[PDB]
DNA sequence: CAGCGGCTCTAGTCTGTCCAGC
DNA sequence: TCAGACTAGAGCCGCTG
RNA sequence: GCUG
């Protein structure tokens, strides 16, 4: 939330982001701007590249290609605002190796 | 003015002399009637209870211009004021038919594969196959 | 034309195989593509692509030519692949115009693609003798007589000279003496002859029986002297019409001359441009008759009368009420038959304008219904694709309980109702495609 | 609220329908050939086989398929009844 | 255009929550376990 | 007995491929069809309707009422889509400028692309080369359009192909029948040759026959785009596995899950969807009523405008008799802007384990140290994992508990994710039951690496890591030698503090 | 029985860094692939050998060590030509149930092919007369997950004669 | 003598304008 | 509020045939 | 609106 009245918390702006890049601090930038804000998991079907739910893909009517991806929630939100605009972000996922 | 009228009752009455067609033999030209159709329109058609016994050519010709769109004869010489060649001929259908049950359904057009309206299980071909 | 490509995926799947479809249908989707590029994009091994193109060049579906790079780019003609749908109809009119021998001539010419004379007469000497009485052997000389008899009326034309490029290999295409020269069938001659049946049925079922026969004998004596690209037939005199009449007729010259000036002056109009243009609208009108009743078909013929005079007369010129009529217009609009309001000239205002007038455009309503009929046969074959794999248990039992046999006769009622219905929509394709080819310049 | 009830309909029934199996008599001739050539096009030389089945099978063994009058006289006539182009 | 986006870049790594390549992300760490790769096989 | 299954398929994102859904893939994702305009039932029970928007088959946005599709709460649920059927097609406002581009490249009469065979081969060769950049593809598309825009007759059908251009907000016009000082072409003359009856009843039609031109519209361009050959689709630079020309015009529309648009002020995004549903019902009623085409066109224009406003509320060319009285967030307005998802929620975001206070000097601290007040230190906790080196240390911290400063607020068991709030219970029992692998959320103590930052940052030295030391007074305090990097001046200045919650984040903070 | 070469990404948690990898992977992989039928593969049992073990990464999260492991594991998969020897752990009237000795009680023979004195009449009659042998005949496995058994067999008994026991 | 074409020029339009707190 | 560097148009004249 |  936004501030002191609402026990809101503090903002890591676009300028503080530019500072941390210049230190090469890749994991701290991941901790601050993902883990301690909006960490989430989505089911992604590797066949159609769309998001699914509960390990089920309604588009394919199958259960075998679905996988879990660690994603910021604001990006999941973006990936559902864009589909309603009919801009489809079809993902492709490799293994983490 | 006559909006409270069913000309669909009168479309068969201006059709049934053109279905029978005595002397279909080709002994001559068979230049065929439009004036006798105006003649049968004025005095008496097949029987029907009609409120508009007044006979104007401007209110009676209009049933023809619908029935040309129901595949009946074109106009030959209506450029004359009352009486000229006026050739006519009832057109029998120039083709057979060409469709199928799947040509009828608009919403069933959507499908493209096994989906919610997939044709591997449609109701319409299941109905047609008995 | 994605539904067209839906059929070429379906037509090759049932006839030859699946990879000859896949490499086939990909070549329809990506065009002028070399041998290595096709095997890399479809994910197919190069040994199977060489075989699949070998079958595809045999049945004349994929044509090869090199221009600049010294590497041959194969190319598949799309509209040839759909002519496989008409294949049993191509058999039948060689039975009405030739015997059982020549009907089998166009059959194995359509089946095995490229044939020499030395093979195809040797094959029908097997098939026709095995169905005739042993000891009463069919003599092959009559086959060679009817073989050329097809060619003098030009129903069978020869293959264009082979490029013989280095990349192309001569040994693989022939399937294993004399060499000879190869040919396919002249199916283009059929599309004249199928049109010859189309116009003679258009006149006989409209004008009179004696009117159609003089159209037939006009067109039967104008076969070699024209082509399919002829805008109309070669002009004839009426004196050779009396010479070319069949012996069944006995009509005097002057009475048929009255019918000759009768048949020359019609709304139908031999103008081959106007003939397919008038036959296509009846195919349109038989679809609205099929679908929206005679009442909406009555206003569908009304817009073919007046080009841009609409909605201030269509409530009057058919006398049907304003409520019942305006749902027929918008259903003819929403299904793209009524075309559109190409007359509005007031600037950028849906509310305030010079009143939008409906107008049928004959070709946009043609190309849609052809695209619809391409979609239609996709739903036909896929059902016959559906009902086949389940019932395979009881086909070999004859080769059995009461519901087991009853499923078979409801299958065989279904498949024969499907397969007959693939051909009845097929005659709508050619009747409209020949109209499509007649209005297409530079092709 | 006037339509807020359910999926419009499972299907929409058109009061007018298809005519028949149109051209009933004569397509008995074409209709058997539809099924005749399909019996012979599948059983032809111009087809492919599932060699992916045999590379899938590591169970190969012996005794299984996986392991295993034209009465005519000579003549020669070559006609150019056809085109002289392309 | 149907464009596919490489998630390699810095800004999309912060959006997607994956560690950026530059800085401490450029290299990988292996554990120096006491292991024998390609070990002796059991004969058939 | 049991079949093998992989326990936890964690994967890594390799790429995002953008694209568009066909109208019949939308129906395969969506769980329900939405048909009802009313948000809520009229009666006092305050339920939403079964087949309208706010239906809980599309998820939930309140803990009071669970989702219907998966029976799970707000915290557990990803959300699910519905769809609206549209009775007439509409332009998608994001794709509209691309719709015109295709119609400038394709022949309007047979849907083939207007290029010479050699030109098509050259463009295909350019597409074939590997390593093509996105900029190169955009440049190639411009070249293909320019060559097409210079041809006026199709090589394939022969029909004339005049200019396609915009003619007002979401309307397209094509000069298929242009007029010239030279003798008029037969096709244009035939088009206007004899509308005598129309001329008799319409005065405007007779004077300027040339002005009337082909009004392209969604019912036509959807029928063209179904007929474009799939061989010619790659030359429009559309990737044929991400979308088709047919998908641009939309006859269907997805409605987002409820968690995209939460139930509380009073939600108006649902009202925008309701207006589209209401218009579709009204248009169907007008067709049944046999209303005039101009009335149908106006209703259709309103439906196109509402769909365009729903995707983007910032359109320039809206007529005065159609302009919104109030401003509303479209999808584009919540993506763009400083408060938009890209900058407000993604590039810069609010973080937890953070604090802020007035700063004041303390020269008796070292330059690497910062004084943290006890009130912040009791709140800002660090999760210390229990192991052999710290077990006896963390026990004493667990015993002190939340109210004494070297203490702990929470304890968490090895394979469990709920947290025991250590204010209750007997802490001397919970200290004895510490196991290795438990997490003790101890208070911030002396020697924690803590980030320290003034609000405007012009360089990297504006945020640095300091070793915390706890002191009683409320301000943050540091040695005045470090005032020059922060540009701090102790005149009621405030500074931010962040406590990195991870061992890897301590090391990167401390060393770098 | 047949060897099956398999590849897995085996995660060793960091409190096992004392033990050697090739042993401590093997203790994990036995807990991953024992008593579990793999679809189209067969019933995994244990670990034969680790044929190739590649280098131990450690990822930006876990702090554990993830070694991609090539190995060979012995599995149970009859070859459609095996005359096995089991025990009747059950008799149903539609067909007998044989079980391989403490291996898997999931082999269910249909019984239509032995000598024309065949019925199981629910009073546990094995066969109307004239260790138990078995001919495993078909492979049949069904993948279980379907919404938000599995190697069953069909087992025959032809005219073997069975000289020792009838 | 006439027609492409690029130049050249209006001018039209949409696109930004620090970080954060209360 | 203040550009601002894109995107079509209107031409223009003069060779380009 | 003001503080930063
Ligand atoms: S079968 Fe397939 S195509 Fe034919 S109607 Fe039903 S859905 Fe439409
Ligand atoms: Zn999927
Ligand atoms: Zn849910
Ligand atoms: Zn064209």
PDB file of N, CA and C and ligand atoms in Angstrom, chain A residues 45 48 57 60, ligand 2:
ATOM      1  N   UNK A  45       1.450 -23.578 -20.100  1.00  0.00           N
ATOM      2  CA  UNK A  45       1.440 -24.721 -21.002  1.00  0.00           C
ATOM      3  C   UNK A  45       2.528 -24.550 -22.052  1.00  0.00           C
ATOM      4  N   UNK A  48       0.931 -24.402 -26.182  1.00  0.00           N
ATOM      5  CA  UNK A  48       0.332 -23.202 -26.741  1.00  0.00           C
ATOM      6  C   UNK A  48       0.940 -21.918 -26.202  1.00  0.00           C
ATOM      7  N   UNK A  57      -4.745 -27.059 -18.704  1.00  0.00           N
ATOM      8  CA  UNK A  57      -4.832 -26.095 -19.796  1.00  0.00           C
ATOM      9  C   UNK A  57      -6.185 -26.240 -20.472  1.00  0.00           C
ATOM     10  N   UNK A  60      -5.920 -26.442 -24.523  1.00  0.00           N
ATOM     11  CA  UNK A  60      -5.552 -27.736 -25.097  1.00  0.00           C
ATOM     12  C   UNK A  60      -6.415 -28.902 -24.626  1.00  0.00           C
TER      13      UNK A  60
HETATM   14 ZN1  LIG K   2      -2.049 -25.512 -23.730  1.00  0.00          ZN
END
